[PDB]
């Protein structure tokens, strides 16, 4: 199996960012509630706030001119096109610019999540180079769930972990 470094998981569904735990009592995916929700309240707010800054925007209205008011008929036309062209630019660019600020927001949220556990584990585990960690100790379906919600007692598993590390340099 493999983490974020080589693609995404069709297996996880309860969220956008999450873990997979392979241990002795069982496998399975599990989303990180905190960061995922954080990416829902954010993207949503982004949407509504795009709509609302567009809630005020120019409104074209038709005006008739006669045969001897060609100069103002043409002024009127350049004016209403002008604003139409300005707001079409502002929308297409706002969307493009914030699309990019969105994909990067996902690409950073993942890496921050990887770093969240890499900081929690340190030498009690070995990072496999594929977005996965191999525990130097046994991690019951209770140490796994400890890591996920950020509640990981390091010294508790510290000893067992250390000994299994120098066995590998025995």
């Amino acid at each position: 199996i493999a983490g974020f470094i080589e693609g995404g998981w069709q297996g996880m569904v309860d969220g956008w960012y999450g873990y997979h735990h392979s241990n002795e009592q069982g496998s399975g995916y599990a989303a990180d509630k905190e960061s995922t929700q954080k990416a829902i309240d954010g993207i949503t707010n982004k949407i509504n706030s795009i709509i609302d800054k567009m809630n005020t925007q120019f409104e074209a209205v038709g005006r008739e001119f006669n045969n001897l008011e060609r100069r103002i008929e043409n002024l009127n036309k350049k004016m209403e096109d002008g604003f139409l062209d300005v707001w079409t630019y502002n929308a297409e660019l706002l969307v493009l610019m914030e699309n990019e600020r969105t994909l990067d927001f996902h690409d950073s949220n993942v890496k921050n999540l990887y770093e969240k556990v890499r900081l929690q584990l340190r030498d009690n585990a070995k990072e496999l180079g594929n977005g996965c960690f191999e525990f130097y100790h046994k991690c019951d379906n209770e140490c796994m769930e400890s890591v996920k919600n950020g509640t990981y007692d390091y010294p508790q598993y510290s000893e067992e972990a250390r000994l299994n590390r120098e066995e590998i340099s025995g």
Partner: protein, 323 residues
């Protein structure tokens, strides 16, 4: 030996949906939100409760003055907005010009409720003929005239000076329309009006207009070289309009009461009625949409999404979708 593991990873799916970036196009993504409305019912609908004035083959001039080919519109009262065709065929049947026409249509785009009333009944013309009529303003084969204005001509063989007034005792503004006939020659003039050097003068608190016929040789339009130029104003409450003439007067019989103003518009569309309802209407069709943008036509009326000229506006929500 193999030990326990945890991984960090992200969502995928069977999502064909793409979005765009300044730096990268057609990015396959898990979730996208389209924010552009690209479809209309193609119909001219009611606007909320209220129904539009489809002038069909008449123009605002024709309707208001009463081109005989526009009798349908003789007693309209309340509308939501006006649809007028691009080039309507029935405007001024008797060839001529409408003074400050556009400024009137613009004024109509702020009105949605008329009440036609009678200010000078034909009965008043007890010393003039009120049966002036033309083949250009002809109804069923037989020559007729504008339904709302009267071609005053000579009775027996005199045209005594006219001096008539109407007082706006109502508490609404009043739209009044008159006109004047330009004869082709002095012979044709006296055959119709007897008198030779003529004028039409209208007076209010604000208006102070003097009109004089212009005899001149013009090209034939609808067979005629004569011309009728028309005029308008707004008579404020408790104000009096005053007509004086000694020939060529086209007197108003009816005047339109402005009962309700309100945001409206005059749309230009070839379409007919559609017998449907909406809260957002464009010249080419109505909109039922929650979207924040649309791209069908800029000239909308009602609570609508914002017009942009885009073919596509779609926002990324989910993540890049790795197949």
């Amino acid at each position: 030996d193999p030990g326990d593991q945890i991984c960090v990873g992200y969502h995928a799916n069977n999502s064909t949906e793409q979005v765009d970036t300044i730096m990268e196009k057609n990015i396959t993504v898990t979730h996208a939100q389209d924010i552009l409305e690209k479809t209309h019912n193609g119909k001219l609908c009611n606007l909320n409760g209220v129904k539009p004035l489809i002038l069909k083959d008449c123009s605002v001039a024709g309707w208001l003055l009463g081109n005989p080919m526009c009798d349908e519109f003789l007693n309209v009262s309340e509308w939501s907005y006006i649809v007028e065709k691009a080039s309507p065929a029935n405007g001024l049947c008797y060839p001529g010009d409408f003074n400050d026409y556009e400024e009137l249509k613009h004024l109509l785009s702020r009105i949605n409720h008329f009440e036609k009333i009678k200010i000078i009944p034909k009965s008043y013309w007890s010393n003039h003929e009120t049966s002036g009529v033309s083949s250009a303003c002809s109804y069923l084969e037989n020559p007729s005239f504008f339904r709302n204005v009267v071609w005053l001509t000579k009775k027996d063989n005199t045209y005594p000076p006219i001096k008539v007034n109407y007082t706006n005792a109502n508490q609404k503004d009043l739209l009044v329309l008159w006109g004047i006939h330009h004869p082709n020659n002095e012979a044709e003039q006296k055959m119709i009006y007897q008198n030779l050097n003529t004028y039409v003068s209208v007076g209010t608190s604000t208006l102070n207009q003097r009109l004089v016929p212009k005899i001149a040789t013009r090209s034939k339009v609808k067979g005629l070289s004569g011309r009728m130029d028309f005029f308008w104003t707004i008579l404020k409450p408790n104000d009096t309009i005053n007509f004086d003439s000694n020939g060529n007067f086209i007197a108003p019989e009816y005047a339109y009461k402005i009962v309700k103003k309100g945001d409206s518009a005059i749309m230009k569309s070839e379409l007919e009625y559609g017998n449907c309802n909406t809260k957002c209407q464009t010249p080419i069709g109505a909109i039922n949409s929650s979207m924040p943008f649309h791209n069908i036509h800029p000239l909308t009326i009602g609570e609508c999404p914002k017009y942009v000229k885009s073919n596509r506006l779609v926002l990324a929500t989910g993540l890049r979708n790795a197949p």
